[PDB]
């Protein structure tokens, strides 16, 4: 079924809701024993958000190697993700020693730090030049190179050094500024023109380690940027274009994380951005 005629039918039928709940019903389930232990207690920003243990992300230390991260592996495609939570204050070191040890190139930031009135996370990068950040547990320091601020989002060069060896590292900070408090986005055009920022980067290319991306819980507006990404990387790649199943793609993308997607509004834009996104993707 022409992925468009699927969404013309749901649509007039008004049936968003109704297949939401069965890719819930369907969505794997398993262990995250780790992200309970009283320990890692202040480690989750969400009591129902958790990595599960098979893909989650360890850090190369002896005391506490947890952090509230996923390994996200779409092996057709040829492209992993690391779809973390937003830093809290005690795991800004952490998520700064996860980019480190990963070898990650970019970050991608879905949402704001202060959001409907409230804190979404922590300010984790510096906000100026001469004013730079140490993050003691971790042995690292971090220090903004430049900013360039459009309408729809901002990027920013950073240098990350791992004070323990004097190696340095460059990193890009991709941040998308403009997800509204409420609901989604009309038109998918000013998320397709990031994502397609964030590919031209090399953020997202084999030859660096997964990139990180991040909203509040790591789950939602993560779950679509992943989800539109790899259903356009398939299109591109079958001999059937009109074979990529987005309700497939997300189940599988469900193995590695729970909950991505968190709405059916979420749901149906993910649908808009891939078929808006096709006609690029398909000589156009
Ligand atoms: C079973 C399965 C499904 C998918 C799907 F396409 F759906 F995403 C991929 C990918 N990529 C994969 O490697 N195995």
Same mark, same amino acid.
């Given at each position: 079924?022409?992925?468009?005629?699927?969404?013309?039918?749901?649509?007039?039928?008004?049936?968003?809701?109704?297949?939401?709940?069965?890719?819930?019903?369907?969505?794997?389930?398993?262990?995250?024993?780790?992200?309970?232990?009283?320990?890692?207690?202040?480690?989750?920003?969400?009591?129902?958000?958790?990595?599960?243990?098979?893909?989650?992300?360890?850090?190369?230390?002896?005391?506490?190697?947890?952090?509230?991260?996923?390994?996200?592996?779409?092996?057709?495609?040829?492209?992993?993700?690391?779809?973390?939570?937003?830093?809290?204050?005690?795991?800004?070191?952490?998520?700064?020693?996860?980019?480190?040890?990963?070898?990650?190139?970019?970050?991608?930031?879905?949402?704001?730090?202060?959001?409907?009135?409230?804190?979404?996370?922590?300010?984790?990068?510096?906000?100026?030049?001469?004013?730079?950040?140490?993050? *003691?547990?971790? #042995? !690292?320091?971090?220090?903004?190179?430049? $900013?360039?601020?459009?309408?729809? +989002? /901002?990027?920013?060069?950073? *240098?990350?050094? #791992? !004070?323990?060896?004097?190696?340095?590292? $460059?990193?890009?900070?991709?941040? +998308? /500024?403009?997800?509204?408090?409420?609901?989604?986005?009309?038109?998918?055009?000013?998320?397709?023109?990031?994502?397609?920022?964030?590919?031209?980067?090399?953020?997202?290319?084999?030859?660096?380690?997964?990139?990180?991306?991040?909203?509040?819980?790591?789950?939602?507006?993560?779950?679509?940027?992943?989800?539109?990404?790899?259903?356009?990387?398939?299109?591109?790649?079958?001999?059937?274009?009109?074979?990529?199943?987005?309700?497939?793609?997300?189940?599988?993308?469900?193995?590695?994380?729970?909950?991505?997607?968190?709405?059916?509004?979420?749901?149906?834009?993910?649908?808009?951005?891939?078929?808006?996104?096709?006609?690029?993707?398909?000589?156009?």
């Amino acid at each position: 079924m022409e992925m468009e005629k699927e969404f013309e039918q749901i649509d007039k039928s008004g049936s968003w809701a109704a297949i939401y709940q069965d890719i819930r019903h369907e969505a794997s389930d398993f262990p995250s024993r780790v992200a309970k232990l009283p320990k890692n207690k202040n480690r989750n920003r969400y009591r129902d958000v958790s990595p599960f243990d098979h893909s989650r992300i360890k850090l190369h230390q002896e005391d506490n190697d947890y952090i509230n991260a996923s390994l996200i592996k779409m092996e057709e495609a040829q492209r992993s993700y690391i779809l973390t939570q937003g830093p809290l204050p005690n795991t800004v070191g952490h998520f700064w020693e996860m980019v480190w040890e990963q070898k990650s190139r970019g970050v991608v930031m879905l949402n704001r730090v202060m959001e409907k009135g409230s804190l979404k996370c922590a300010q984790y990068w510096p906000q100026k030049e001469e004013k730079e950040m140490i993050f *003691e547990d971790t #042995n !690292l320091k971090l220090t903004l190179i430049s $900013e360039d601020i459009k309408s729809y +989002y /901002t990027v920013r060069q950073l *240098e990350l050094e #791992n !004070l323990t060896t004097q190696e340095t590292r $460059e990193i890009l900070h991709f941040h +998308y /500024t403009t997800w509204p408090d409420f609901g989604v986005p009309e038109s998918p055009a000013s998320f397709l023109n990031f994502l397609f920022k964030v590919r031209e980067s090399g953020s997202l290319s084999p030859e660096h380690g997964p990139v990180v991306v991040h909203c509040s819980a790591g789950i939602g507006r993560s779950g679509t940027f992943c989800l539109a990404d790899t259903c356009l990387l398939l299109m591109d790649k079958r001999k059937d274009p009109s074979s990529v199943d987005i309700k497939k793609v997300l189940l599988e993308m469900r193995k590695f994380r729970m909950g991505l997607i968190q709405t059916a509004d979420q749901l149906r834009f993910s649908y808009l951005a891939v078929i808006e996104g096709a006609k690029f993707i398909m000589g156009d």
